[PDB]
């Protein structure tokens, strides 16, 4: 069966650092164009980052520079390095496979993230 | 400034067709392809419509998608109770080089 | 009384990182040749790593590069830095004193390690 | 490829001497020293025999160890119930520069 399962979500202090991870089964993360999208409670999916087959990355405006997406060599799993958080990064991050640039076919369940003391 | 605009809510009684309109600047929706996602409560977005008209992998029928100029339209013949969810519209804004999503409609059955 | 007690064992995700530790009493870890050996449930002790008096380290084939053994300056305690785990690292690691290269005289009780989600 | 070979199991009734044979390539057991460990259930290996014949720190007697060519032999006069454990044989394989252990025997008293 196809499935993407993500872990790494919990409370964290402002300015902290996390390694969220996206684990892929039935699919191969080192090939299909993979995407990290978010949705703060009561809000709208916002594109965070897309990883291309060839390694190229794209990030949104608000999430530029601080963050990083990466693709494991052999574990069949992808990871977001979230650094320099603020109040507007409270989220339920999802990892999703996106045929090309056209539509996002498969969505992971969801990994809460909180920025508070 | 491109971020597609979508009505805050749309409501209809069962048996009445429901129309949702996603409008945006022709930088992203007039030159690229819309796609439409459904988010049931407490779950994860499920693709509903792709490539401006198609219906993938045997989605329940009567779900229709169309594109007119700089706008996109989703249609559901009747308003079934199970269809209650949030609906989003997404296009690849090349000017921002970013996926851009709509506001999201709270479909409520009367 | 002579004793070696080890802690740091629990569930962890694939690719994680742990610092297992070996605490030595009645003995001095900065001198006796100390060893980390493992045994997956239903399996055989496999040599993981040996630390010499003079600081030199030796590691096995399967456990090369990813891992690291270290010897504290003053705490009288030794530590394994386990990094880049996989399925074949499910284990009950033990730390043991080994007269020279000839025989392993004292064995610690055991610290489970699991690699699963 | 050197990893010493040991029979999967050995069993005898009480009062009958038990013999265990650990065989390996003469790269590690023909040039270095065997040593023999005992692992009681749910515990930690306890050294039993060292330096190819010796018996350390007053181990219960009648435990014997010998080395013939490229093989090593452990012997227990009689098969006592308490001796039930797993038995391992270990040598320092210089070719692999690594401690190498045997398969382990499940000693069961008949």
In angstroms, the CA D25 to CA D70 distance is 7
Is B102 in contact with A60 (Cβ distance < 8 A)?
Answer: no
Domain for residue D59, yes or no?
yes
Question: How many domains in chain A?
Answer: 1
What's CA C32's distance to the chain center, in Å? Answer: 14
- What element of type H or E holds D105? strand D105-109
Q: How far is A81 from chain C (nearest CA, A)?
A: 14
What's CA A80's distance to the chain center, in Å? Answer: 6
3-state SS assignment for residue C93: strand
Check if C2 contacts D (Cβ < 8 Å). Answer: no
Q: Which residues of C touch D96 (CB under 8 A)?
A: 61
Question: How many domains in chain D?
Answer: 1
Domain for residue D102, yes or no?
yes
Nearest residue of A to residue B52 by CA position? A102
Domain for residue D1, yes or no?
no
Task: Report CA-CA distances (Å) from D74 to B60, C85, D6.
Answer: 73, 37, 11
Is A103 in contact with B101 (Cβ distance < 8 A)?
Answer: no
**What was the elucidation method?**
cryo-EM
In angstroms, the CA D94 to CA B20 distance is 75
Check if A104 contacts B (Cβ < 8 Å). Answer: yes
Check if A92 contacts C (Cβ < 8 Å). Answer: no
CATH at residue A79:
2.60.40.10
A44, A102, A110: residue with CB nearest B35: A102
Q: 């010998």: which residue's tokens?
A: D66
Token pair of D72 as six digits: 């090593």
- Experimental structure resolution, Å: 3.0
Domain for residue D36, yes or no?
yes
What's CA B100's distance to the chain center, in Å? Answer: 12
In angstroms, the CA A116 to CA A81 distance is 18
Report strand pairing: C111-115 vs C11-12.
parallel
In angstroms, the CA A24 to CA A2 distance is 8
Is C117 in contact with A75 (Cβ distance < 8 A)?
Answer: no
Round to the nearest angstrom and report the end-to-end CA distance of chain A.
39
Domain coverage including residue D82: 9-109
In angstroms, the CA A107 to CA A105 distance is 7
Domain for residue B27, yes or no?
yes
Domain for residue B3, yes or no?
no
Domain for residue D4, yes or no?
no
Domain coverage including residue A20: 3-115
Q: Check: CB of residue A97 under 8 Å from CB of residue A3.
A: no
CATH at residue B63:
2.60.40.10
In degrees, to the nearest 5, what angle opens at C-alpha C17 toward C-alphas C11 and C22?
80
Is A103 in contact with B50 (Cβ distance < 8 A)?
Answer: yes
> In sequence order, what DSSP letters do the residues of chain A get, joined into one string?
--EEEEE--SEE-TT-EEEEEEEEESS-TTTS-EEEEE--TTS--EEEEEE-TTS-EEE-STTTTT--EEE-SSSSEEEEEEES--GGG-EEEEEEEEETTTEEEEE---EEEEE--
D56, D88, D96: residue with CB nearest C45: D88
Q: How far is D110 from chain C (nearest CA, A)?
A: 22
> In sequence order, what DSSP letters do the residues of B21-36 get, joined into one string?
EEE--TTTTTTS---E
- What element of type H or E holds B10? strand B9-12
Q: How far is A75 from chain C (nearest CA, A)?
A: 8
Q: Which residues of B touch A61 (CB under 8 A)?
A: 96, 98
Q: Check: CB of residue D83 under 8 Å from CB of residue D76.
A: yes
In angstroms, the CA B21 to CA B34 distance is 11
């Amino acid at each position: 069966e196809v499935q993407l399962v993500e872990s790494g979500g919990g409370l964290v202090q402002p300015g902290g650092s996390l390694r969220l991870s996206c684990e892929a089964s039935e699919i191969i993360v080192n090939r299909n164009y993979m995407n990290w999208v978010r949705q703060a409670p009561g809000k709208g999916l916002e594109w965070v980052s897309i990883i291309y087959p060839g390694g190229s990355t794209f990030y949104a405006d608000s999430v530029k520079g601080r963050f990083t997406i990466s693709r494991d060599n052999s574990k069949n799993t992808m990871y977001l390095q979230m650094n320099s958080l603020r109040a507007e990064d409270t989220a339920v991050y999802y990892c999703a496979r996106s045929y090309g640039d056209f539509y996002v076919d498969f969505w992971g369940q969801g990994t809460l993230v909180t920025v508070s003391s | 400034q491109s971020v597609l605009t979508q009505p805050p809510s749309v409501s209809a009684a069962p048996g009445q067709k429901v129309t949702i309109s996603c409008s945006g600047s022709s930088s992203n929706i007039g030159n690229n392809y819309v796609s439409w996602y459904q988010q049931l409560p407490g779950t994860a977005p499920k693709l509903l419509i792709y490539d401006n008209n198609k219906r993938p992998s045997g989605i329940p029928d009567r779900f229709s998608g169309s594109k007119s100029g700089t706008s996109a339209t989703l249609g559901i013949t009747g308003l079934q109770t199970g269809d209650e969810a949030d609906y989003y519209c997404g296009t690849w804004d090349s000017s921002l080089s970013a996926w851009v999503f709509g506001g999201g409609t709270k479909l409520t059955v009367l």
